[PDB]
Amino acid sequence: LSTGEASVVLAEKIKGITQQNDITEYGTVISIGDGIARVFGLTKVQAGEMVEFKSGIRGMALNLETDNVGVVVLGND
């Protein structure tokens, strides 16, 4: 074992998953329901910011939690 295994993990992560875009500006939907979506890794977002999903429908970042972001969708779930 070694401590420099970070590069190994980094290399494995970049290849195995065709994902992990610029997390600072993008996020993934953990769950959606009851007019609420639990986004993930939408860091650097501001409270009250306006986000947009894939389909183009928009939402506002109401709650900013440590792990996820609570966004209210301005449309049909």
Partner 1 sequence: PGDKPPAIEDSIHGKYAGVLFSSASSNKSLNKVAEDMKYFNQLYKESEVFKSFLNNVSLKRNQQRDIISALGKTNFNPATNNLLETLIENKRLDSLPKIAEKYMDYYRILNKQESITIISAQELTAAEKQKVEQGLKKGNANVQFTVVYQVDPAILGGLQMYSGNNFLDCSLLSRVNKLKTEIAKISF
Name the residues that contact partner 1, by CB under 8 A.
1, 3, 5-6, 8-13, 16-17, 19, 28, 30, 40-41, 67-68
Judged by beta carbon, residue 16 or residue 48, the one nearer partner 1 is 16
Q: How far is the CB of 28 from partner 1 (least distance, A)?
A: 4
> Beta-carbon neighbour count of residue 60 at 10 Å?
13
Task: Give the single-character DSSP code of 25.
Answer: T
| Min CB(74)–partner 1 separation in Å | 23
